[PDB]
Amino acid sequence: MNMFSSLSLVTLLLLTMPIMMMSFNTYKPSNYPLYVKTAISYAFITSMIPTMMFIHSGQELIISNWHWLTIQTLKLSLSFKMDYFSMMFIPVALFVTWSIMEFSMWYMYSDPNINKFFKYLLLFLITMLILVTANNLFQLFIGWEGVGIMSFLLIGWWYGRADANTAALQAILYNRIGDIGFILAMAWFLTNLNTWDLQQIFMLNPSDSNMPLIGLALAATGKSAQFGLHPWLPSAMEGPTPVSALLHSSTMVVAGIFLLIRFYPLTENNKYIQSITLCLGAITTLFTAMCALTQNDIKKIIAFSTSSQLGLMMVTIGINQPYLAFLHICTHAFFKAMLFMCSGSIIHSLNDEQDIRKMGGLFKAMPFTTTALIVGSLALTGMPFLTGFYSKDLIIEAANTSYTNAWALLMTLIATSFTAIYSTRIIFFALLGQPRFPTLVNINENNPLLINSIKRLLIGSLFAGYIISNNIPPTTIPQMTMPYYLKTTALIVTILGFILALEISNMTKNLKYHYPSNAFKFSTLLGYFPTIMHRLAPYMNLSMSQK
Amino acid sequence: AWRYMGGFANNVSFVGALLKGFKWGFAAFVVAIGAEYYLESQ
């Protein structure tokens, strides 16, 4: 207990030290980025010890070290919940961040504000760990809004570029609309219960939990970019590639799902909320997977891939499998982060070219980036026994055999086929065919920082799902009896997606003119939602404000 | 024409891309299941 608690807190304290020593205290500007990378590396090791103790005996702790404020009958203390979800996520987040920081040392090498960039990345991580270890709603709100502000600062990193500022403000706008639901939940729990502490909320276990859970669902919709409040996540591609890797894997986007997982003791008993989260997840996963089918920017395809996966996690919440949704968070972090780093490897070698129509012929020219991209794509598409199969495959079986909305089940299966198609699309246009890029060939991936960072995530995308799934204690009764056509649905629809995608991608080489259907235009322009909404609502609000 | 010549001339298919490393991965696998099945007799 004494070693478990001390090491849990030293993991967090260790991460704030590089921020603290920025105030001239043996601060070596020489290699501040290397110093920050080393701190993440040591924080990962110290966080492995409490995790091992939890894997062994299931030991769990609440540390309420500091009493901050008492408002009559409401004590607010700095309290940390070192539980199942914290013990597994923190090591995964630190492992992925360790690779993204080492990748950034090579990717952001020429940036004159390299030090400020690593400070912001480190702050992004600290505010996310405050979020996941928070034991009370107020402490969670600190991390909740902290990650949002760090997204704004990192999305708008290149602040001279007007589109970067617009995308950064867009992220704040959509997330703050979700935060209406967050404060709604806080107000309801304080008034109806008498607490913001997770322990007292679960102990009282209210039955009329429609209002607080709708508020929490609204907060998740904005933060995890579910349908309605989704456009900001693809626009967040304005930021440098390392920001997208951290934003889309182990930070920000999964905080919305994580919030609903933490409140599974309440959603377990609210079938109305399960229906709403199920339907919201199903339309999100289908809609964004459709948008990715026609995108040409390699970062936008992966951004819509994240929204589609976030929709699948939301579906898993709606079928009452919070522990499978958490597992997908952990597995998805490994290969989604790797894919962004592979894309940055391609983008760097083609002098900041991001349009896949100008790539091609890279299969042999970048053998290590190619290997990681194929491994990452296969993990994403649920290739048996890679990291993604150990969550996605179970989620599909659980949904297939659940008492569930049939249309939501169908939309989720189609989105699984679409995952194979837009994955095939990246591989086909990026790696295969003939070079379509300019003539001065600067392709070079022989940088140890690049290889090592990708390599550690490649190993994660192979064995992390197997290792994690074989250590976590069971908290449900998995459904293992079902007909063969329900057991293999995920594999079949994924294979059909590859077969269908290859046929369509091979049709592009034919010497036949190509006209755009209404469906193609719908997919290309993101269902028109950004175009209509980001012109109409700003116009209506701004035009009335002046008068 | 440089895009279709000398180095870029031949690229794998999609299936060939997927099966990169299969030959050595499968050769290692056969050795491993041979090594394991041997210990079964022992």
């Binding site: 042999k364 020219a365 060939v441 600067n442 392709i443 070079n444 022989n446 | 440089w2 180095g7």
Partner: peptide, 14 residues
Amino acid sequence: AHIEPRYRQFPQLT
């Protein structure tokens, strides 16, 4: 710079 760039040719690999 270990790898010199090449013009209209397949790149150098390690």
